[PDB]
């Protein structure tokens, strides 16, 4: 029972931590580049109008 429960706990911990690490990194990236692209686009729009 001890062996099984320890294996289950280790598997859960590793899976959860690695999935969060894999996903949140790219999510934050996409957010940062989205902000940057919006900032870039505003100036072009302003110049274009005049």
């Amino acid at each position: 029972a001890i062996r099984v429960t320890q294996s289950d706990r280790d598997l859960f911990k590793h899976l959860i931590t690695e999935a969060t690490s894999y996903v949140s990194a790219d999510y934050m990236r996409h957010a940062n580049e989205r902000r940057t692209h919006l900032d870039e686009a505003l100036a072009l729009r302003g110049e274009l109008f005049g």
Partner: protein, 50 residues
């Protein structure tokens, strides 16, 4: 001469269109993702501000 200038204007217009479409697509994808993570995995687990 005015048409020569409008050529640069159209170039800038194409650039602005490209940037705007990119930003709009990014925003739409972000909104779709947020609506797909209504399972409550986003509040802190996905949004690791660190």
């Amino acid at each position: 001469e005015m048409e020569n200038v409008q050529k640069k204007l159209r170039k800038l217009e194409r650039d602005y269109y490209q940037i705007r479409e990119q930003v709009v697509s990014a925003k739409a994808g972000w909104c779709a993702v947020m609506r797909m993570v209504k399972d409550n995995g986003v509040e802190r687990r996905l949004h690791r501000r660190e």
